[PDB]
Design a binder for this molecule. Structure first.
Ligand SMILES: [Mn+2]
Ligand SMILES: [Mn+2]
Ligand SMILES: [Mn+2]
Ligand SMILES: [Mn+2]
Ligand SMILES: [Mn+2]
Ligand SMILES: [Mn+2]
Ligand SMILES: [Mn+2]
Ligand SMILES: [Mn+2]
Ligand SMILES: [Mn+2]
Ligand SMILES: [Mn+2]
Ligand SMILES: [Mn+2]
Ligand SMILES: [Mn+2]
Length: 732
């Protein structure tokens, strides 16, 4: 209509070859996921690929010049198609959508126009359109104009539904006057058209035409000047009813064009999917076409049905990866990121807890029985659709998939973390009168006018009522216990923070619902993502702040280190840990040596703190939790590095591969590649230890954590792809 014209380079491929087109959309739908179309309706199986182009503008005139070519197309497509892509699309029967059970009537309806292209690189020529359209307009009738120059050329029958055919050659063996037969009936051509279509031939004495109706021709190739490999479907028609199409409209071109209603339908499919389930599926950040495929992959647990997923068409992700495989490799990855988040946040939520109990709590939340509950609460099962022909499929899987999907979306870890906070903790996780002292204490809190003697009352009654805000029972129980250790005057900061999250996530106003469960939850959230660090039991409290190193910051919550209520807590630890008096001897020497032996560029002025975190990784009994964290991160890191490295592989492959480089022995050897000073301190702290010992692999994970903790994530990530990634053995 106006400048508004996003370009897309289509490529319709079939047995014969590729057909390119320039798709102009009046809307922003990011990149469009290709899709292949099964064999049927006269036309054979094919594949359609998309790929963003330039944002081509158009002067109203050029817009009318496009209109023309379009009508041409609509005419070559026949009467079974209304001259309007937008209409051809909005007429779609429900059974042809990716979610036929969730059809929405979106506000707008994209406008599309297809243009011919010689090569995926060729520019847009608005003048080449005239020439083209002219050719069509000045198209003679075969009876106006040898059988070797028409062989292969296309031609339709205007008076005959514009059906399309491919000229094979003039058959002088007979003429329109000739005869053909049926079981118990012999008729002349001329007569037939007069009887049926009720048309009166004029050049009845003209030599008939021998061509194959495009339908029948499905994918069969064209013989040579009648050697007629397979000629039973072959038919004959009056050169006068034949309108020879100009060279350009060659088979490839023609037939390829029979797959445009479908590209339109595709756009219609998408759009419909988007605004129908968009606010019903965990937001990933994606939009348009990618948000679509993302929804299909997460909601279409079963594969297409012969004909296809959404009609005859079946959308494939980058590298032609099925939505099925995508779900497979997003869960695998969601499982790991989810695992790492939990390990990190629990460490801080229970800085005094032991690894043992820290691992029990983890499962307590990452457990299938648990996630299968968060999924039920997310109302996903209802949207989940599939023909129960798929066997170890689980709801819980969907949770990890979403997590894996948020991460790879533009929202990333910041997204998974949010998704996580909301879901794992909720007032809907506990059951349910109350005294007066509590009710009044509730409101006062709802408006900050609440103090220390008002929260304790709230925690105790929530302590003696069995209030739970985690999908787990022990975790919840364990939670309330922590609060007991928390000084009342510190809880309002956790609240104002929890209530802060509930808001920017659109799941709550500026102020809480005014209930005790509600109140407790806002603390939970806040304490979940708020706690500064943990203790390395009998030597201070390690601060978890590898998140302030991320290139993108989120002050609204976390804030800055230059200073908030929460922010100040972490930094407090950070310094107190620098305020420690390094006993510098060897553990410090090894610590130093490891620092420069990273072969990785860590952010500046991050060294001193790193060294600290290294000595701790080196000293025995203390590296306990660091290892726990390293293990988790490493698992996440690798999965990622492989996920990117092998876009076509699935779970198993990806699993076996990363697990290969996680075994202690593997990690241990790495630990040895450090200048002996390291190996030395180990043996130093451990009497009569062996080269195949565990501590070797275990301290490595301890190190890895030390990098993440002090240098940030990506720094550690590079650490992994530089030293550990290389050790992954190939399935082959
Ligand atoms: Mn309908
Ligand atoms: Mn008549
Ligand atoms: Mn992917
Ligand atoms: Mn603790
Ligand atoms: Mn389980
Ligand atoms: Mn599975
Ligand atoms: Mn699972
Ligand atoms: Mn609001
Ligand atoms: Mn591991
Ligand atoms: Mn791959
Ligand atoms: Mn030992
Ligand atoms: Mn280990």
């Amino acid at each position: 209509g106006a400048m508004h014209a996003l370009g897309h380079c289509c490529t319709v491929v079939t047995t014969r070859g590729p057909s390119h087109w320039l798709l102009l959309l009046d809307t922003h739908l990011g990149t469009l996921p290709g899709f292949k179309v099964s064999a049927g309706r006269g036309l054979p199986a094919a594949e359609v690929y998309f790929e963003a182009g330039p944002r081509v503008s158009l002067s109203r005139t050029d817009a009318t010049i496009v209109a023309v070519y379009q009508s041409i197309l609509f005419q070559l497509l026949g009467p079974t198609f209304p001259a309007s892509w937008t209409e051809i699309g909005a007429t779609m029967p429900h059974n042809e959508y990716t979610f036929p059970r969730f059809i929405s009537n979106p506000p707008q309806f994209a406008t599309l126009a297809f243009l011919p292209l010689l090569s995926p690189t060729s520019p847009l020529d608005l003048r080449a359109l005239m020439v083209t359209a002219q050719l069509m307009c000045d198209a003679k009738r075969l009876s106006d104009e040898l059988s070797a120059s028409l062989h292969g050329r296309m031609v339709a029958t205007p008076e005959i539904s514009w059906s399309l055919y491919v000229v094979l050659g003039i058959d002088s063996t007979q003429t329109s006057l000739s005869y053909f037969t049926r079981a118990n009936e012999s008729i002349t051509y001329m007569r037939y058209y007069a009887t049926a279509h009720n048309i009166h031939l004029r050049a009845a004495d003209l030599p008939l035409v021998a061509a194959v109706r495009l339908d029948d021709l499905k994918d069969h190739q064209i013989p040579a000047p009648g050697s007629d490999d397979l000629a039973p479907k072959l038919r004959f028609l009056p050169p006068e009813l034949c309108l020879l199409l100009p060279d350009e409209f060659d088979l490839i071109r023609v037939q390829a064009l029979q797959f445009l209603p479908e590209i339109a339908k595709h756009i219609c499919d998408i759009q419909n999917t988007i605004c129908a389930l968009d606010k019903s599926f965990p937001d990933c950040g994606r939009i348009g076409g990618e948000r679509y495929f993302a929804i299909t992959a997460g909601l279409r647990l079963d594969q297409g049905r012969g004909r296809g997923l959404a009609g005859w068409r079946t959308p494939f992700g980058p590298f032609g990866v099925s939505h099925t495989d995508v779900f497979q490799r997003l869960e695998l990855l969601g499982d790991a990121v989810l695992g790492f988040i939990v390990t990190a946040r629990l460490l801080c939520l229970f800085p005094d807890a032991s690894v043992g109990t820290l691992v029990e709590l983890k499962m307590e939340l990452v457990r299938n029985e648990a996630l299968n509950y968060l999924v039920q609460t997310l109302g996903l099962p209802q949207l989940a659709e599939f023909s129960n022909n798929l066997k170890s499929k689980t709801w819980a899987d969907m949770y990890e998939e979403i997590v894996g999907s948020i991460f790879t979306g533009p929202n990333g870890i910041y997204g998974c973390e949010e998704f996580l906070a909301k879901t794992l903790m909720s007032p809907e996780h506990s059951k349910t009168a109350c005294p007066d002292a509590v009710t009044k204490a509730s409101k006062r809190v709802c408006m900050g006018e609440a103090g220390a003697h008002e929260f304790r009352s709230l925690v105790d009654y929530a302590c003696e009522q069995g209030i739970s805000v985690f999908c787990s029972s022990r975790v919840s129980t364990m939670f309330l216990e922590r609060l007991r250790d928390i000084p009342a005057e510190d809880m309002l900061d956790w609240y104002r923070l929890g209530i802060q999250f509930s808001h920017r996530s659109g799941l709550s106003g500026p102020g809480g619902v005014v209930s005790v469960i509600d109140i407790m939850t806002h603390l939970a959230r806040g304490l979940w993502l708020g706690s500064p660090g943990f203790y390395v039991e009998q030597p201070p409290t390690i601060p978890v702040l590898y998140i302030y190193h991320r290139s993108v910051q989120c002050p609204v919550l976390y804030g800055s280190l230059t200073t908030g209520p929460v922010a100040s807590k972490v930094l407090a630890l950070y310094e107190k840990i620098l305020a420690y008096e390094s006993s510098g001897g060897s553990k410090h020497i090894a610590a130093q040596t490891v620092s420069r032996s990273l072969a990785v560029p860590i952010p500046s002025g991050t060294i001193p703190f790193l060294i600290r975190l290294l000595q701790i990784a080196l000293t025995p009994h203390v590296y306990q939790k660091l290892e726990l964290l390293g293990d988790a991160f490493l698992k996440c890191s690798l999965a990622l590095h492989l996920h990117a490295l092998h876009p076509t592989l699935t779970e198993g492959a990806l699993t076996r591969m990363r697990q290969s480089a996680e075994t202690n022995s593997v990690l241990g050897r790495l630990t040895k590649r450090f200048p002996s000073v390291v190996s030395e301190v180990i043996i130093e702290s451990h009497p009569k230890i062996q080269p195949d010992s565990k501590v070797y692999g275990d301290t490595f994970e301890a190190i890895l954590a030390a990098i993440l903790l002090a240098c940030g994530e990506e720094a550690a990530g590079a650490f992994v792809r530089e030293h550990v990634l290389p050790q992954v053995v190939a399935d082959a």
